[PDB]
């Protein structure tokens, strides 16, 4: 479980060159934490899924202020709409196909 | 060149305890176990290897004697190649030309090297682990916690100055406050170690430079403390031993062992038993042993070996049974063709 | 620079209990039990030791001197060097050799040593010799203490591995002034602790294949026997001897 | 500041019965076939009844203002006086007595008894006498007040041991008696005058 530093690099090349807010589905916890590692918070505020965390938390963190929002996991039929209800992320970046470990 | 086999007891007078690298970890003082966790331990062969290596370097020490001074003629390298067995000035290769049949003669020249060996050449003696023969027969000896002097009994302080009770009590104060700050820190810490084993993989990387500089926290606080750099009233950590009395048997082999090398053994089991200790803790006592060896002979293409006699050590004196290891022994001493320098 | 073995028996004249937090349980202060549930309770070397240590220091002080204000010259580092052997202070290669003269003009961290300095004496575990010489005392809902018996034969051995003359006398006049309160473990309610003990100190040349028997010291409620006049040699050695600094380390 | 020991025997003229407080036994000095014993938990508790009643009747740093709680102590503070127990010295001597029979030593029965005062100084270490003395008024060391059991004389011989010494020298001869009290020693009723003399106390 070693991510290649040059996707790394990539992928927050693209995540930043985002102009609006984004939601992120990487397919680890660990995968979050490295994504959020590697990038610089230059664009507004990243918000990030701790390993074993609560997505609904920062779904009302993230209503009151839409961003980029990193989660993976998460999901499970879930959305972070807003109040009303209105498509509050014109992306929706799915960093890796969340391959399953093999299973011996 | 006889193969002389060591098989007997090693009967425990006194707990007998060491700690290997290995052995031990966070949770605790632990015996070396013969193979997975709930194994029965062994005490190492490696420290009676030594034990029984630093006794015979002493015998050879004693032998060449002493000059009016008190300094034996050897210099460091050759102590540290006679009982460390590690070279000084680099004059130790593995499979070397040059060295082919040059070995006999060293051997011959250097019983202890020939007997212990050293980096390149083959120690012919081989030190068995101690398996203990029967159940139980270990278990937590030392234990036991620093206190305060003066708290114990108070006769000490008629003993100390007002100025240096006034130290005492700041000390007390001090080491207590402390005691707190670490105690909380160590709540932190175990919270911490809770998630550092149930965790995802490299999120508890994070978790161990926590770890890690959270124990610098503890260091700085140790700094911060003044006086006492530790703490004083502190319990000890009770180190695993094998109870007295326990029997282990031992088996050391000595692989085509001249009459030299042999008396050269049994002089340093003779030494050994002028103070027969094995392991650590000696300011517990702990190591002191009796131990009866039967040395067996081999002779290649014979179908039993014979027995050349028996060897006990007890408190009470060396007991040497058999012609045989009391001519090795003659032979040892006798032999006035010993070069240690070489 | 002998090597002398004290072997011997103590007889306890009272219980003798040691609250070992490794044995306690939630039956309450068991011994420690030298196995598993069903051996032997052995009385730890430690409480001996410390025992001992506090009465080598004991002397140290008394032999250092008192000034007119009944005070002892020694400050508090050096008093919890002496005894416990802890770095109040807090102050290596160039200790190799250090040790050697550290030794030879502080006898006592020599014999007991310090967090680094080998200690020279070995006070080992006292083992009983029979069986059923060990039950439960302090009936007074209290917890009732485990103890040995009433003259329960426990089997010492102590070792001083490399002593010289003042070195021995030191741990001989130590064995002298641990007699005055020949008292062991805890529970000094209850009297418990006080034991009458003689050691047969035998020495051993290395190289020799017997060892040779020094005398014998023994420690009863009506006096101190030290006998071969060996043991006595080393005491005055020890007595006489008015060259130790204890304020090096 | 000597370390006084009293060695001595008690000689016991009733059946002497303790744990009053499955069948009504004496404890057991190590298994259940040894010998038994009479605990010095009742006794220090008749020592410790004694030096209440006797500062009562009168009237480290914490050892000068009140003697009996340096003798005895508090919980965070160590006593100097320890009370053994009464072993018995020769076989058999001790039968069922006495409803429920209870345990007792034999009239006549005489028990070697150790009790010792660590670092004593003669100011508080004079209270610890006192309180023999006054016990003698009242010689108490059984379990039972029906049965008045406890009725005992005993014979303590005070060795204090300066320490360094190789022997320990005898300040006198402490005998406790239905008869009344006898002491010995001029050193000892010294000592004893020095603890009347100071008048340092607290209740408790």
Known sequence: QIFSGQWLKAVVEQLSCIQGPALVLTASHYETRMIANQLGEVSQPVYIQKAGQALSEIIKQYQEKPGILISAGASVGVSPRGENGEQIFQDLIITRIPFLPPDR | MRTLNFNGKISTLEPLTVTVKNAVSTSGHRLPRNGGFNAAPYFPGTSIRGTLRHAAHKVIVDRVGLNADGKSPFDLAEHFMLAQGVDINGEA???????????????????????????????????????????????????????????????????????????????????????????????????????????????????????????????????????????????????????????????????????????????????????PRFGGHANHNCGLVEAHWTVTTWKPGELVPVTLGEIVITPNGVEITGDELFAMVKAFNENQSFDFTA
């Open chain 2, 93 to 275: 290769e593995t499979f070397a030309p040059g060295e082919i049949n040059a070995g006999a003669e060293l051997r011959s020249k250097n019983p202890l090297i020939s007997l212990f060996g050293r980096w390149g050449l083959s120690g012919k003696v081989g030190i068995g682990n101690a398996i203990p023969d029967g159940d139980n027969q270990w278990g937590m000896f030392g234990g036991g916690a620093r206190s305060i002097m003066f708290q114990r009994d108070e006769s000490l302080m008629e003993f100390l100055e007002t100025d240096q009770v006034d130290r005492l009590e700041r000390l007390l104060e001090e080491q207590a406050e402390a005691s707190v700050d670490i105690s909380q820190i160590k709540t932190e810490q175990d919270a911490l170690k809770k998630a550092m084993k149930s965790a995802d993989k490299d999120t508890k990387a994070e978790l161990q430079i926590k770890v890690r500089e959270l124990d610098e926290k503890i260091q700085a606080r140790k700094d911060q403390k003044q006086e006492s750099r530790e703490s004083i009233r502190r319990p000890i950590d009770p180190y695993e031993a094998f109870i007295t009395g326990a029997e282990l048997s031992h088996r050391m082999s000595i692989k085509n062992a001249t009459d030299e090398e042999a008396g050269l053994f049994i002089s340093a089991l003779i030494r050994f038993a002028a103070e």
